[PDB]
């Protein structure tokens, strides 16, 4: 029961750092880049800052 | 008391005096430090040893 509790705390802390959007979940938990269009998100084209 | 610097000699040359409670100087300071510190790169909860 102690090992379960420690993993639950690791899980919720990982969710707090990285964000819980499904595109964010996949990168933090499995280390995977998932395409925005696969997930039905608007696509970022380009940008500049000055 | 005499050996201390005196802001009143500069003050008669200024259009707005400090005797009128206008500060003589307005300064912008930008610090850039490189610190090599005895800390982990990111501090992420959970311990290596028990």
């Amino acid at each position: 029961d102690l090992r379960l509790a420690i993993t639950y705390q690791h899980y919720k802390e990982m969710d707090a750092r990285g964000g819980t959007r499904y595109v964010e979940f996949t990168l933090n938990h499995f280390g995977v880049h998932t395409a925005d269009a696969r997930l039905q998100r608007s696509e970022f084209l380009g940008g500049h800052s000055q | 008391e005499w050996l201390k610097e005196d802001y009143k000699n500069v003050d008669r040359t200024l259009a707005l005096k400090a005797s009128d409670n206008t500060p003589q100087l307005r300064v912008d300071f930008m610090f850039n430090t490189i610190a090599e510190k005895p800390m982990p790169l990111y501090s992420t909860p959970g311990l290596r040893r028990i």
Partner: peptide
């Protein structure tokens, strides 16, 4: 070395950059 333009307003300079999607602390926000 001393003389410079009518363009100096602050000690800090900001560099132009291309924007990229990133994952900062707490999820994506621009």
């Amino acid at each position: 070395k001393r003389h410079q333009w009518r363009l100096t307003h602050s000690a800090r300079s900001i560099k132009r950059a291309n924007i990229m999607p990133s994952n900062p602390r707490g999820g994506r926000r621009f």
